[PDB]
């Protein structure tokens, strides 16, 4: 086990360093100025760490949600928080809000969605999926409404491209904004590492074992949704991550969550970074990373399924 974690936490660094060797004013042979040094500290490094934490975050969210719903085909989008956040950001863009206004709006409707799912939940697992499905429909329709009634000259293109998400405009201000919730949520979730195994228990056994299913599920849903809301706030809509990463991780360290969470976080971080510095390499222009996670993810998903 430790041998696997140490290995994954190795690629993470190796790929991070190698990242410095891509783009304008980069490196080429230095196995680890004055311009290079500034490009690294103010531009490159910020994006590298942002991809790493966002990859770890979306993967984390995917794996814990898969445990809650006892289904490997679940992703951090079934609770409808991604659509809620997408709408929050879209709305902020539509009214020409400020950067901080976008963050608050994105998180506000992101948490707001979780709250709605909770309220309608109290007024089963399948039911949460249905409720979140309803909210996603509502939010994606409102998003469509806004872009339809928005100026096609400047307003529209902004809404459209933000919904694609990328790390092209990542900076130290955003990284630190997301990093706080990220470190918070990931810590609690990691401390509940073992208890997550109890999410697979059935009602009767859970009660006998003193497991408080309801409170536990919601604590995880909230932390899981908080990560995604904050992630969307600083990088837009990114998909096809939480689905395949936990699977690859279970191929490496097994099903016990106590070992799965840390492993999925590490594999997710490296995977996102690899994809992000491909969005740069691939072309002269910045292709939104959402296009790449889908073009890489989907086929990879097939390959992973193919090998039953």
């Amino acid at each position: 086990y430790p041998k696997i974690l140490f290995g994954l936490t190795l690629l993470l660094v190796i790929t991070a360093v190698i990242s410095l060797g891509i783009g304008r004013y980069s490196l080429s042979v230095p196995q680890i100025d004055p311009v290079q040094q500034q490009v690294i500290f103010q531009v490159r490094l910020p994006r590298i760490l942002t991809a790493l934490c966002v990859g770890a975050g979306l993967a984390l969210s995917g794996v814990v949600l898969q445990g809650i719903f006892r289904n490997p085909l679940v992703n951090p989008h079934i609770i409808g928080v991604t659509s809620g956040s997408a709408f929050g950001g879209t709305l902020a863009i539509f009214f020409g809000f400020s950067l901080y206004g976008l963050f608050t709006s994105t998180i506000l409707f992101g948490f707001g969605t979780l709250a709605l799912v909770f309220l309608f939940s109290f007024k089963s697992l399948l039911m949460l999926i249905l409720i979140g499905m309803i909210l996603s429909g509502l939010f994606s329709a409102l998003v469509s409404l806004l872009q339809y009634i928005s100026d096609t000259e400047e307003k529209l293109p902004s809404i459209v491209f933000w919904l694609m998400g990328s790390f092209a405009t990542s900076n130290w201000e955003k990284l630190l904004f997301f990093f706080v919730p990220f470190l918070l949520c990931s810590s609690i979730l990691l401390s509940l590492s073992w208890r997550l195994n109890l999410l697979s228990l059935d009602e009767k056994e859970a009660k006998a074992l003193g497991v408080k299913m309801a409170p536990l599920r919601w604590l995880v849903i909230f932390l899981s949704g908080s990560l995604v809301a904050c992630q969307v706030a600083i990088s837009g809509s990114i998909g096809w991550v939480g689905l395949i990463i936990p699977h690859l991780s279970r191929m490496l360290v097994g099903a016990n969550h106590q070992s799965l969470l840390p492993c999925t976080m590490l594999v997710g971080a490296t995977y996102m970074l690899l994809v992000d510095n491909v969005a740069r390499s691939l072309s002269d222009a910045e292709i939104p990373i959402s296009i790449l996670t889908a073009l890489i993810g989907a086929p990879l998903f097939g390959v992973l399924v193919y090998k039953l």
């Binding site: 401390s191 509940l192 073992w194 228990l201 056994e205 009660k207 074992l209 003193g210 099903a255």
Partner: protein, 251 residues
């Protein structure tokens, strides 16, 4: 001393839309109670009530021993290992944000050892047979260190040889480890084999008491709506009784 008490219990069972009333019975440490009934008779609700998932319409339920539960099956799309499943039984011995300790692994391991399944610890739960799976589920309840163990249809889906192992195990838990056992079944021969107390569930009606007082041709015939008769037998000098259902075609 008392292990469990059920007084004036009344509850509804949606499935068959019938209301049970004034159910009474108590169990002491070391007792083995068989809840004999047929498919969807209220066993599900009964167990739910004993574990307190929800409150009953009338009556009270008091449990005096730590309670453990064993479902008939454990279904999960995840490749959990035997140890992973049993260890979950340490749930109440680990704090919410804590990790299991060496002691927790110790208890789980001795639980497996007690059942002579140590050589299964690393195996993938779903790669085991039905009998081994059911036994592993009893182990996880054991690792919880409960004194009152409730089992839902522990033998129904196992081959005969494994049902035999399970019956012997339950007797050993009650007689040697002073545990109290409650299991559901539809098989009267298994009831006379190990249960000193039995509860018969038949359409909103029931009967509780000493097994020899309850397991009679008359009570079983009314419960099964088919003639049932007690039969004596001797196998290599060993006397025993069993019950035979009288199918019209046997005549």
């Amino acid at each position: 001393n008392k292990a469990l008490s059920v007084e004036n219990l009344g509850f509804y069972y949606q499935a068959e839309n019938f209301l049970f009333q004034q159910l009474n019975f108590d169990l002491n440490k070391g007792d083995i109670l068989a809840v004999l009934g047929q498919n969807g008779c209220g066993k599900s609700t009964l167990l739910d009530l004993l574990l307190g998932i929800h409150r009953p319409i009338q009556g009270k339920i008091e449990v005096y021993q730590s309670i453990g539960f064993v479902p008939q099956f454990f279904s999960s799309p995840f490749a959990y290992s035997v140890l992973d499943i049993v260890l979950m039984g340490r749930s109440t011995h680990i704090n919410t944000f804590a990790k299991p300790k060496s002691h927790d692994y110790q208890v789980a391991m001795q639980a497996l050892d007690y059942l002579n399944l140590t050589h299964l610890a690393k195996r993938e739960f779903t790669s085991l047979s039905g009998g081994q799976r059911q036994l592993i589920l009893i182990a996880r309840a054991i690792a919880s260190e409960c004194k009152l163990i409730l089992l839902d249809e522990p033998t129904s889906a196992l081959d005969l040889a494994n049902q035999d192992i399970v019956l012997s195990l339950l007797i050993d838990l009650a007689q040697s480890q002073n545990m109290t056992v409650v299991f559901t079944t539809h098989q009267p021969n298994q009831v006379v084999a190990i249960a000193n107390k039995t509860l018969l569930l038949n359409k909103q009606n029931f009967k509780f008491g000493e097994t020899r007082n309850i397991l009679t041709s008359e009570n079983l015939t009314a419960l099964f709506h088919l003639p049932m008769f007690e039969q004596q037998a001797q196998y290599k000098e060993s006397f025993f009784t069993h019950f035979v259902p009288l199918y019209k075609t046997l005549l």
